[PDB]
Structures are given as structure tokens and as C-alpha cells.
Amino acid sequence: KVDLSMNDQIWQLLDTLSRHENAWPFRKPVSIGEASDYYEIIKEPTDIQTMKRKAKNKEYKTLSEFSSELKRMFDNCRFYNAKNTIYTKYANQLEAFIWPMLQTIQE
Numbered sequence: 077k078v079d080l081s082m083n084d085q086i087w088q089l090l091d092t093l094s095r096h097e098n099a100w101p102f103r104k105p106v107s108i109g110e111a112s113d114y115y116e117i118i119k120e121p122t123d124i125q126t127m128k129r130k131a132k133n134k135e136y137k138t139l140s141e142f143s144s145e146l147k148r149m150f151d152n153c154r155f156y157n158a159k160n161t162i163y164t165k166y167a168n169q170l171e172a173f174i175w176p177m178l179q180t181i182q183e
Contacts, residue, residue, distance in 0.1 A: 082181060083131045085180075086136055087128055087131040093124065093173075094124045094128075098166040099124065099170055101153070102149060102170070103125060111156070120148060121152060127142070127149070150170070
């Protein structure tokens, strides 16, 4: 009975990811207040709301396009934080948590 296109399956993966308690620093774009130097360092930013918007508008043509962006979200965090802070710990935890679901996405 349940029928979901690739983009809707991507949206639900992102929803699962966002609902994790430690996903909070990735739900929306980084604010100037929290990190005024952020966009001087991260030249290809992304976040859950951006990817959810892309998914809802059925903009992912392939799974690779989304998986590169989702990996980039975790990579950006770890680069900005120089592989340190609580954010690197969350990034590692969440990537390992969501990677099994990423394998199930059907094109």
C-alpha cells in the first residue's frame, strides 16, 4: 500500500536523521551569532532543511547526488571543527547511524 519515490524516500531518511537528539546542529543553516566565521571556511554548506527542501521539490536526479551532499554535511562539520569538539562526535555518530538507511534508497 505504501508507495514512495526516491525523493520521498530521501525526505524520510532526512526526517529519521533530524529526529535523532544529536542532529540538532544540522537541522538548519549555521547562524552568524553561533559561528560568525562559518561561511569564510565552508564554501559548499548544506543542512537537513536544505536537503529536505530539495527532496520535497523532487530535485535529486540520482541517489549519488544526495549521498555526496549528505556526506558533505558531515565533512563540513568536521572540517570547520578541525575533527574536534562535540560536533565532530555527533557528526561521526549520526553518519554511522544513518548510513544503513542510505543503502535502502531505491532509484
